Ligand binder design. Structure first.
Ligand SMILES: CC(C)CCC[C@@H](C)[C@H]1CC[C@H]2[C@@H]3CC=C4C[C@@H](O)CC[C@]4(C)[C@H]3CC[C@]12C
Ligand SMILES: CC(C)CCC[C@@H](C)[C@H]1CC[C@H]2[C@@H]3CC=C4C[C@@H](O)CC[C@]4(C)[C@H]3CC[C@]12C
Ligand SMILES: CC(C)CCC[C@@H](C)[C@H]1CC[C@H]2[C@@H]3CC=C4C[C@@H](O)CC[C@]4(C)[C@H]3CC[C@]12C
Ligand SMILES: CC(C)CCC[C@@H](C)[C@H]1CC[C@H]2[C@@H]3CC=C4C[C@@H](O)CC[C@]4(C)[C@H]3CC[C@]12C
Ligand SMILES: CCCCCCCCCCCC
Ligand SMILES: CCCCCCCCCCCC
Ligand SMILES: CCCCCCCCCC
Ligand SMILES: CCCCCCCCCC
Ligand SMILES: CCCCCCCC
Ligand SMILES: CCCCCCCC
Lengths: 524, 524
């Protein structure tokens, strides 16, 4: 279940946004420096404590327990916008049940008269747009001029959003497993369809330029600090780390269990599939580039939904457009639904034991399931509006990416490396997994991750570039302040809990900090 | 370790030889009818008996125990020629240690003056040959006019053959594990390089025609019975079934072990990698087809070594030819060496307990290791000669493929389905794997496999077409008789043992057959 939408949507969009292969160098650097390190860190914390996200930190250190609450805020904010991605896929699937796909040609009402089939884009107001972009913006999104103009709500997406929310609600309400029936179909189908797209994508006449764009890096983009943050957060996003799910996932694992092999295996496949999937989508872009006579960096739309622009273009070029289009949206929806079933249930599982005596399992719990879904439905309803795409971009860049992931990832390593000690963790690890691992992990949590986290944070601050959508829309100042509020909401959690914890322990600050620094029953 | 030279070399050659996608329909039919069925059959026999190839049949049925000896003959004959494939790869690797690859251009001594670089083939004695083919036939094989002309021995291959034989001898002699050190590098590297070739192969300008050739079938070829036999034996070859290795492999498995999941998983990946690998090599052929202005069915050489013609052509188009060429031959040699380490040690392990009191572990055993390797070295030395390629084709088509695999596969199912009973096996299976499986297996061993095995055998006999090499060389009558002798050697083992055992049990034939039909201590 390592495959998610991030690997097929977030990764391609981020890599496309950040030049070409210039994304890869920070991507693999962050992978081998922190990603697998912090992934194993959370997994082994879960195994050592056999406890949940917030509470395992309490076991490791009563102070700096705000990391757990920060994770809850991130997962909550993530679910609010992650579901809207599934809403688009569901709408596309519904539109893929018609004989001729709507985006195959642009002669319908919503298409701007300046549209022209990609086949004639080069064959024949110099700026000519494509049907695939038109359907996504003038039909699926009804893009408004700006975030300051919300406009009329699009009920089509709202209904699709309600459906996916209801599917998620019932699955959690009825304790339905994340993978339905046999896990194989839920597993091999994403691989099969991805390989179907890859074979089609590579075979495309323009795939050569796309792969060269995909792999050959640009050192100039490395100077811009945004690529380092995005690559670092990409890994943080795809592995679903710093959200408390992996700590819960490691909880179920037995004390005597070789989680090291699982983490490095599941870690490399999750990134490996993303890298392979990057070949397919970027191969499409090269084909679109030469067919349209437009540069690869400008042939697609640099906003979330690159998976909704290049991949539906491939299914159009597939032997049976309708057949393949339906299957793609099925696997796309499948990769998102299973993620939601696990990540949504994580916070309620985190919330139910967070505030007991009121959320007892049963009547109190069942209404809470709808309560979480409904409030998050109204909040997720904002992205449905015509200008809700821009709000979505703020949620993607800030709520569960950007500085927020770096800050929490830093404190996860900062606590374990110094307050708890990387050497002290190995003593449990060799007891648990049976053998003491090498020095790659210890020198990553203590040095590589803290250096990478702060350096990206600091260089971001001095070289501050405001967030832009489609590299052409400048956000208003208030929206950036609103966007930072989501990030500040999660990051402020750690310091806030520290102050509360210190107050609880009346006494000299030094005595109080030392008292609560002591780990409390780390393992049983 | 499911990947072998069968998936990277045997499948491409067979598919290429038997038209295009017309190979696939019998391929998947035989897969789902017998391949996974007989694979699980041998695995579950090994698990139920926890005993070796010959002896497990004795447990199931003292009569029809010749299946074990037939497997020994097949594995022995297979090892004699399988090693010569590694000898070619080793020679290619040695030739890949030079700055410029020898087959990149044809201006050397061995190249016929009628050769012309593929780049100039279409750009410019109408039949013009290519350097890649020239290097393989002239420098690597020194192809003689016919099998009736052996000619001078090529010492280069003989030395390479001795080296791989010595590597195999020492690994078995020192009990070295099949996978050296960490299994990961022995495992992920074949996948990585295969995916490197696939990305390069698909990106090639002519990959479109090759995939269409690969997938779109021809019903006319289905009439020819040779495609059904080759597809059936391809599955039998790639899974290394009907050789007694899987029976030994299933022996190590615990009685309470879900081998069903392992078999269907390892079964589908082994065929899945072969199918994916077929895309890469056939993509190359389409690129060679359009660059040479020659049909895909005639652009390569229809003899064993298609992996030595298309794949080295691919690395000549990769960014670092020498770098990738060395890596390819490394993974090619890796896919063969590990197979030899396991399949060679299988027969000595089968021979040592077959004739005890003389092959005791130690001084008697160690000289036997060289004795098996040396005799098989002299026998494998025949394919090294200039005309030894044709002898190799006889070994490929007859010794461990063709009718020989069908006959033994038939009797494996014929014994279990009728003499032992498919229902009786399930009673153990539900006790072992914990749950009774479906009716797909039982109706395959009793109906699908026996119908497929005999039907291919019968239609082969009535529509007899003599074996040909490169679709242009007609073998002499004596060579076919020699070739059938290898096949008749293995198949005749079954009836021979039956007569010997019937003699052992003096009495009425009906009483004797019934007495030895009774299973003897099937499980402990
Ligand atoms: C899945 C992992 C192993 C990555 C896939 C392969 C990696 C190693 C990359 C590195 C360099 C790459 C090559 C670099 C340049 C080109 C030229 C282009 O016109 C076709 C693709 C091709 C030939 C690339 C194929 C893939 C490649 C070999
Ligand atoms: C909307 C923006 C401002 C985000 C606001 C986040 C609020 C709702 C969150 C973030 C940090 C949270 C606090 C952090 C720590 C604790 C200590 C615990 O023992 C009781 C709850 C308490 C006191 C939390 C209450 C709720 C809280 C204040
Ligand atoms: C690995 C398994 C799933 C097989 C790989 C994909 C299978 C399902 C096959 C079946 C039909 C195939 C397509 C049939 C025809 C063509 C046209 C050709 O010009 C490019 C490849 C393309 C577009 C094929 C891509 C691969 C394909 C989709
Ligand atoms: C070179 C060609 C003709 C192949 C010859 C194969 C010979 C060497 C093999 C094939 C079948 C074998 C026989 C089959 C069965 C048994 C019964 C066993 O209890 C003693 C060995 C004995 C009697 C085998 C002796 C060797 C044998 C005759
Ligand atoms: C000028 C009006 C702009 C309205 C923007 C609404 C943004 C909603 C954000 C919701 C965050 C939870
Ligand atoms: C006319 C001479 C032809 C010689 C052919 C030799 C074939 C050797 C076969 C070895 C089988 C074990
Ligand atoms: C081109 C005809 C397509 C008809 C609908 C197919 C739906 C398949 C769902 C698995
Ligand atoms: C010989 C010059 C090209 C580099 C070859 C490197 C081969 C590495 C094999 C592991
Ligand atoms: C300028 C502020 C407009 C409304 C912002 C609402 C944020 C939840
Ligand atoms: C016509 C027979 C030539 C020699 C055959 C040798 C077979 C081992």
């Amino acid at each position: 279940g390592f495959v998610g939408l991030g690997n097929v949507w977030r990764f391609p969009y981020l890599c496309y946004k950040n030049g070409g292969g210039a994304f890869l160098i920070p991507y693999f650097i962050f992978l081998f420096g922190s990603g697998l390190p912090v992934f194993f860190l959370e997994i082994i914390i879960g195994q050592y404590t056999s406890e949940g996200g917030i509470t395992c930190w309490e076991k490791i250190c009563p102070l700096f327990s705000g990391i757990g609450y920060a994770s809850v805020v991130i997962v909550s904010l993530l679910n609010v916008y992650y579901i809207v991605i599934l809403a688009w896929a569901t709408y596309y699937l519904f539109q893929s049940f018609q004989k001729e796909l709507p985006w195959a040609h642009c002669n319908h009402s919503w298409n701007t008269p300046h549209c022209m089939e990609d086949t004639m884009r080069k064959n024949k107001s110099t700026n000519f747009t494509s049907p695939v972009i038109e359907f996504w913006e003038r039909n699926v999104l009804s893009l408004s001029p700006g975030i300051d103009h919300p406009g009329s709500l699009k009920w089509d997406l709202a209904l699709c959003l309600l459906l996916v929310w209801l599917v998620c609600f019932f699955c959690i309400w009825k304790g339905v497993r994340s993978t339905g029936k046999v896990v194989y179909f839920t597993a091999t189908f994403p691989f099969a369809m991805l390989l179907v797209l890859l074979v089609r994508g590579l075979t495309l006449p323009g795939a050569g330029a796309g792969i060269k764009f995909y792999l050959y890096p640009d050192i100039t983009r490395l100077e811009d600090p945004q690529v380092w943050i995005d690559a670092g957060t990409q890994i943080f996003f795809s592995y679903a780390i710093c959200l408390g799910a992996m700590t819960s996932l490691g909880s179920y694992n037995k004390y005597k269990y070789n989680s090291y092999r699982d983490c490095m295996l599941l870690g490399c496949l999750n990134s490996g599939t993303s890298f392979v999937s990057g070949f397919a989508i970027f191969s499409i872009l090269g084909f679109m580039a030469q067919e349209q006579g437009v540069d690869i960096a400008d042939v697609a739309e640099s906003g979330p939904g690159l998976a909704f622009i290049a991949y539906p273009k491939a299914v159009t070029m597939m032997p049976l457009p309708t057949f393949w289009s339906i299957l793609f949206f099925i696997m796309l929806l499948l990769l998102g639904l299973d993620s939601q079933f696990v990540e949504v249930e994580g916070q309620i599982t985190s919330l139910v034991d967070l505030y007991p005596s009121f959320l007892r399992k049963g009547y109190r719990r069942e209404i809470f399931i709808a309560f979480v879904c409904s409030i998050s439905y109204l909040l997720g309803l904002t992205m449905v509006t015509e200008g809700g795409m821009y709000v979505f971009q703020l949620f993607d860049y800030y709520a569960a990416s950007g500085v927020c992931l770096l800050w929490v990832a830093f404190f996860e390593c900062f606590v374990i490396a110094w307050i708890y000690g990387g050497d002290n963790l190995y003593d449990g690890i060799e007891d648990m997994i049976g053998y003491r691992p090498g020095p790659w992990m210890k020198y990553s949590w203590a040095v590589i991750t803290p250096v990478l986290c702060v350096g990206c944070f600091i260089f971001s601050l001095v070289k501050y570039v405001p967030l832009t959508y489609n590299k052409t829309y400048v956000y208003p100042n208030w929206a950036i302040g609103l966007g930072w509020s989501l990030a500040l909401s999660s990051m402020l959690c750690v310091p806030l809990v520290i102050v509360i914890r210190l107050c609880q322990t009346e006494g000299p600050f030094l005595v109080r900090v030392k008292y609560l620094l002591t780990p409390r029953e780390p393992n049983r």
